[PDB]
């Protein structure tokens, strides 16, 4: 069971994690180096022991694909998860006083579509600039599925300081065998309680999208974590969630045949049968 | 973090791996996404079921650290593992007609010490150019141990076309807690029988070096693999190797207090009690 692996990681962190503070000084139980395999075969890994913000997962990814680094473009979709990091106070705390609100810097969207390009601002035109990693992985999957270099890297040391926040998802690698597309994510830091479930859904979704455009079947989503942690305040709540028997994962349905990654829209996706346990 | 995890991985690939060919149409049994943990606490992960080319590991790493991209600089040390990719014929095959022999392009050393810098040639001076990820990692470890961004990435989409080979160890992350330095390597592709043991030792050594430079004790080396594979002509040999009784890992002795990562020399290291099953 995929979810069982996730809950297993949580148990392991409770049993073997050690105290480790984050940037704010808040404590967490932490374990370095973890890995879970989530099958994407005939099911979508949207955790059931606790509700995952699906609209956020979907809109954020379409926003990444779009190459946007403007939090306002995601906020207007009803997803505010990046608004704080693009706010005046936050951008100023980073020294980006002349940066317009919403300008997150060269984050995912930019890295994925224009890696290496000289970031100006969120409104700048980068067409033809940088390496379009996303389309490249798609091309490679179609032409040379055996390729062991189908990677999309968001971790750009040069652009790091310009980003409102360093990416938690440094890079992901795709793999194809027997008509199945698999994806492994290297997540440098994961909040098992709140972020990871969302993280998992995001990349499983990216895989489903690429598999659809490349005519492959979703295979496995391998979630690799660097600092896998649990905030101390989620220990008891998590001990409760761990008591809940996971439910069948929902299924993802793509309502139409999409040809290019850029053509996907929120409306083309439908999460069916998602029945998460009641909020804790 | 035992060698039993490495053996277990081999066992799993032999058991669940599926046929997948490499760039040369050569078949391998492959599993995508694997991870093994190797304790570095009072022991060094130099595999004992089959001898690892320690000199190669040590010299290659020192070579990475000095930021060299000149295979000749490593070859002169008696380590020829990079010579082929820097040869006149190989360089020309990739269209690098203007490159002096040995010029591997912006590979590991360059990325590690000058990420983002404009690669010219192996003789070019890149002082203060690009991001020195290695020193930054060391600086961050010393100043903010809790940092969850202690990463050194060799994967540079931008420089890929200029390299003799795309980096295999795409990136590694370090982690500090309870005065222990851990390192996790994300290896996109790994030949379980040949490269992986070497790869493991390389990053284990790097961790030992940085741990020593930062006054921390080596913790764990987590090896994460993308396409973990075994070449077909290695199945039987590896199955035999799986029969070999794993022995206690040797110890890595650092014979001197080194202040800067750049000051480490081959002679500062000594593998002790390495007793691998003969080949």
Tokens of A92: 């100023």
Tokens of A122: 């969120």
| CATH (domain of B276) | 3.30.572.10
**What is the three-class DSSP state of B192?**
coil
Instruction: Report whether A208 belongs to an annotated binding site.
Output: no
Helix-strand-coil split of chain B, %, nearest 5: 35, 25, 40
CB-neighbour burial class of residue A43 (10 A; exposed 0-12, middle 13-18, buried 19+):
middle
Beta bridge partners of A115: A131
Beta bridge partners of A228: A31, A190
Residues in chain A: 280
Distances, alpha carbon A238 to alpha carbons A33, A36, B179, in Å: 20, 18, 28
φ/ψ of A115, rounded to 5, equals: -55, 130
Q: What's this structure's resolution in Å?
A: 2.0
Experimental method: X-ray
Tokens of B125: 């001076």
CB-neighbour burial class of residue B131 (10 A; exposed 0-12, middle 13-18, buried 19+):
buried
Tokens of B192: 């379980």
Under 8 Å between Cβ of B122 and B109: no
CB-neighbour burial class of residue A192 (10 A; exposed 0-12, middle 13-18, buried 19+):
buried
Instruction: Count CB-CB contacts under 10 A for residue A208.
Output: 21
Tokens of B119: 């690669």
Instruction: Report whether B153 belongs to an annotated binding site.
Output: no
Return d(Cα A29, Cα A238) in angstroms, integer.
12
Long-range CB contact pairs, A22-27, < 8 A, 24+: A22/A229, A22/B146, A22/B148, A23/B146, A23/B147, A23/B148, A26/A231, A26/A232, A27/A231, A27/A232
Instruction: Report whether B256 belongs to an annotated binding site.
Output: no
Beta bridge partners of A229: A30, A191
Q: For residue B244, give how far its alpha carbon lies from the nearest alpha carbon of chain A (Å).
A: 27
Mutate to test the interface with B, among A227, A228, A229, A230 (most CBs of B within 10 A): A227
Q: Say whether B178 and A153 touch across the interface (CB within 8 A).
A: no
Long-range CB contact pairs, B64-67, < 8 A, 24+: B64/B108, B64/B109, B64/B112, B65/B109, B65/B112, B65/B113, B65/B134, B65/B209, B65/B261, B65/B262, B65/B264, B66/B109, B66/B262, B67/B109, B67/B110, B67/B112, B67/B113, B67/B114, B67/B126
Return d(Cα A71, Cα B219) in angstroms, integer.
39
Number of domains in chain A: 1
Distances, alpha carbon B95 to alpha carbons B98, B160, B162, B263, in Å: 8, 14, 10, 36
Distances, alpha carbon A28 to alpha carbons A234, A242, B148, B153, in Å: 9, 18, 12, 26
Under 8 Å between Cβ of A183 and A222: yes
Under 8 Å between Cβ of B268 and B255: yes
**Residues B155, B157, B162, B168: is their CA dihedral positive or negative?**
positive
Cα distance between the two ends of chain A: 22
**Ordered DSSP codes for B96-162:** -TTSPTTB--S-HHHHHHHBTPPP--TTS--TT-SB-HHHHHHHHHHH-TT-S--EEE---TTTGGG
Under 8 Å between Cβ of B101 and B88: yes
**Residues B81, B56, B68, B139: is their CA dihedral positive or negative?**
positive
Q: Say whether B20 and A131 touch across the interface (CB within 8 A).
A: no
**Residues B183, B184, B190, B196: is their CA dihedral positive or negative?**
positive
Return d(Cα A250, Cα A42) in angstroms, integer.
9
Tokens of B143: 């100043």
Laid out side by side, the sheet with A217-231 consists of A18-21, A27-39, A217-231, A180-191, A169-177, A151-153
Query: Longest Cα pair distance anywhere in chain B, in angstroms?
Result: 51
Q: Note the Cα A191 to chain centre separation in Å.
A: 12
Q: Which of B181, B157, B216 is nearest to A173 (CA)?
A: B157
CB-neighbour burial class of residue B184 (10 A; exposed 0-12, middle 13-18, buried 19+):
buried
Beta bridge partners of A152: A172
Which residues 6+ apart lie within 8 Å of A76 measured at CB? none
Return the CA Rg of chain A: 18
Return d(Cα B124, Cα B122) in angstroms, integer.
6
Tokens of A200: 């998992």
Under 8 Å between Cβ of A231 and A274: no
Tokens of B117: 């810098």
Return d(Cα A25, Cα B140) in angstroms, integer.
16
Token pair 């809950």: residue: A7
**Ordered DSSP codes for B212-243:** HHTT-EEEEEEEEEEEEEEEGGGHHHHHHHTT
Mutate to test the interface with B, among A25, A33, A203 (most CBs of B within 10 A): A33
Q: For residue A132, give how far its alpha carbon lies from the nearest alpha carbon of chain B (Å).
A: 9
Distances, alpha carbon B243 to alpha carbons A104, A266, B23, B191, B236, in Å: 54, 53, 31, 19, 11
Q: Half-sphere exposure of A252 toward its Cβ, with a 13 Å CA cutoff?
A: 28
Enclosing domain of residue B60 = 1-279
Q: Which of A204, A198, A199, A215 is nearest to A251 (CA)?
A: A204
Tokens of A39: 């099958």
Q: Say whether B153 and A153 touch across the interface (CB within 8 A).
A: yes
**What is the three-class DSSP state of A50?**
coil
Q: Say whether A158 and B130 touch across the interface (CB within 8 A).
A: yes
Tokens of B126: 């890149």
Tokens of A157: 């040391």
In b/e form, how buried is each residue of B215-236, taking b as 16+ CB within 10 angstroms? ebebbbbbbbbbbbbbbeebbe
Tokens of A3: 């979810």
């Amino acid at each position: 069971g995929s979810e069982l692996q996730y809950l297993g990681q949580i148990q392991h962190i409770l049993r073997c994690g050690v105290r480790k503070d984050d940037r704010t000084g808040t404590g967490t139980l932490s374990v370095f180096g973890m890995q879970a395999r989530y099958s994407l075969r005939d099911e979508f890994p949207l955790l059931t022991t606790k509700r995952v913000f699906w609209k956020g997962v979907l809109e954020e990814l379409l926003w990444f694909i779009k190459g946007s680094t403007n939090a306002k473009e995601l906020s207007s979709k009803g997803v505010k998860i990046w608004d704080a990091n693009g706010s005046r106070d936050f951008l100023d705390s980073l020294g980006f006083s002349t940066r317009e609100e919403g300008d997150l810097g060269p984050v995912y969207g930019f890295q994925w579509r224009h890696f290496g390009a000289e970031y100006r601002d969120m409104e700048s035109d980068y067409s033809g600039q940088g390496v379009d990693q996303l389309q490249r992985v798609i091309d490679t999957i179609k032409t040379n599925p055996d390729d062991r270099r189908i990677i999309m890297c968001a971790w750009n040391p040069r652009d790091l300081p310009l980003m409102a926040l360093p990416p938690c998802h440094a890079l992901c690698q795709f793999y194809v065998v027997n008509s199945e597309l698999s994806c492994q994510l290297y997540q440098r830091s994961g909040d098992m309680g709140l972020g990871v479930p969302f993280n998992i859904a995001s990349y499983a979704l990216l895989t489903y999208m690429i598999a659809h455009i490349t005519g492959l079947k979703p295979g496995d989503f391998i979630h690799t974590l660097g600092d896998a942690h649990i905030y101390l305040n989620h220990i008891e709540p998590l001990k409760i969630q761990l008591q809940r028997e996971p439910r069948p994962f929902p299924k993802l349905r793509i309502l139409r045949k999409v040809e290019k990654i850029d053509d996907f829209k929120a409306e083309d996706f439908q999460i069916e049968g998602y029945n998460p346990h009641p909020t804790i």
